[PDB]
Amino acid sequence: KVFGRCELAAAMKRHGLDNYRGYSLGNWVCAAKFESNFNTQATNRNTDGSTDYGILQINSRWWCNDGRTPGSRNLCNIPCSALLSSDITASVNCAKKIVSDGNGMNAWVAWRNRCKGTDVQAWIRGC
Amino acid sequence: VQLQASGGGSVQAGGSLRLSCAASGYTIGPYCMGWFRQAPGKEREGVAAINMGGGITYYADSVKGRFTISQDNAKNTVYLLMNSLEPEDTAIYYCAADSTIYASYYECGHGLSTGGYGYDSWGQGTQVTVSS
């Protein structure tokens, strides 16, 4: 499912992402936009064999186990397939661990590149 | 966390040297380990990086073809084999790690080529001097 901006914002809000660890919700909507374009099914295979899954493009050598990635640390103790669901709960649940583990939102390359130090609330205004 | 480099010294132009770096005190990671060098009177240069585990490598255009970075795993140990050493390679070599466990795929040579962004943990420098 390809969420709508304001649709994803509402779903993330309900899933407790607003001001999570202090990150206003616009951070989460912008990350999701430049990570997966709001497509909960997006997968991107990487040069090291690993693949990025879901709406927040979570990676298989460290966060989830997809079965075809050598050395998967699987830090989220979850299959990668649980992140391609239209129900962002697993993704949101894992995104919290990444963030609460001290990585910050820097863990998302797209956020650090297209959102950090930008007017992120632009991403939720009008919903 | 600790980073302990080894190797370095002096050698004649044309010879080779092998540096090493073991990250210690890590529970998870590092995501990246690489090498930087501060030649006398020049800008700090990002030399080579490797994506821990995944194993992808990146090299500065100067050292491309001559250096080779690899990992022994274990205590997050990596090596830089330096062949065809020229006196221009004389500099202080620093080991560096990026402790962030990225959510999405991050290519380590990204922070290396752009000022060492992301490489938070640094080690002691090791002088390498190429004679002749």
* C-alpha closest to that of B114 among A123, A38, A113: A113
What percent of the residues of chain B are helix, what percent strand, and what percent coil, each to the nearest 5? 5, 50, 45
Write the residue in B55, B103, B118 that is nearest to A63 by C-beta: B103
Asked if A73's CB is within 8 angstroms of B103's CB, the reply is no
Pairing of strands B126-131, B9-12: parallel
How many other C-beta atoms can be found within 10 angstroms of the C-beta atom of residue B131? 12
Distance CA B33, CA B26 (A): 13
* C-alpha closest to that of A64 among A55, A51, A45: A51
Distance CA A52, CA A64 (A): 10
- The nearest CA of chain B is from the CA of A59 a distance in Å of 5
- The nearest CA of chain A is from the CA of B91 a distance in Å of 32
Distance CA B24, CA A6 (A): 45
Distance CA A6, CA A97 (A): 24
CATH number for position A109: 1.10.530.10
Q: Is A45 on the interface with B (CB under 8 A)?
A: no
Under a CB-based contact definition with an 8 Å cutoff, are residues B18 and B11 in contact? Answer: no
Sequence spans of domains, chain B: 1-132
Write the residue in A48, A49, A59 that is nearest to B102 by C-beta: A59
Cα B59 to chain center, whole Å? 9
Distance CA B87, CA B76 (A): 30
Residue A94: give the domain boundaries: 1-127
Number of domains in chain A: 1
Instruction: Scan residues 7-26 of A and list those with Cβ closer than 8 Å to B.
Output: none
Residues in Cβ contact with A22 at an 8 Å cutoff, skipping those fewer than 6 apart: none
Asked if A48's CB is within 8 angstroms of B51's CB, the reply is yes
The experimental technique behind this entry is X-ray
Asked if A44's CB is within 8 angstroms of B105's CB, the reply is yes
Q: With beta carbons under 8 A apart, name residues in chain B contacting A107.
A: 100-104
Q: What are phi and psi for residue A9, nearest 5 degrees?
A: -55, -50
Provide the resolution (angstroms).
Answer: 2.5
> Which CATH number applies to B1-132: 3.40.50.300, 2.60.40.10, 3.40.50.970, 2.40.37.10?
2.60.40.10
| Sheet with strand A58-59: strands edge to edge | A43-45, A51-53, A58-59
Q: What are phi and psi for residue B29, nearest 5 degrees?
A: 95, -165
* DSSP per residue, chain A: -B--HHHHHHHHHHTT-TTBTTB-HHHHHHHHHHHHTTBTT-EEE-TTS-EEETTTTEETTTT-B-SSSTT---TT-SBGGGGSSSSTHHHHHHHHHHIIIIIGGGG-HHHHHHTTTS-GGGGTTT-
How many other C-beta atoms can be found within 10 angstroms of the C-beta atom of residue A51? 20
* C-alpha closest to that of B66 among B128, B108, B124: B128
Asked if A73's CB is within 8 angstroms of B55's CB, the reply is no
> In degrees to the nearest 10, what's the CA dihedral of A120, A56, A85, B28?
-140
Q: Which residues pair with B95 in a beta bridge?
A: B35
Do the annotations mark residue A101 as ligand-binding?
A: yes
State both tokens at A109: 């390359």
| Residues of A catalogued as catalytic | 35, 52
Distance CA A55, CA B46 (A): 33
The last residues before gaps in chain A (C-N over 2.5 Å) are none
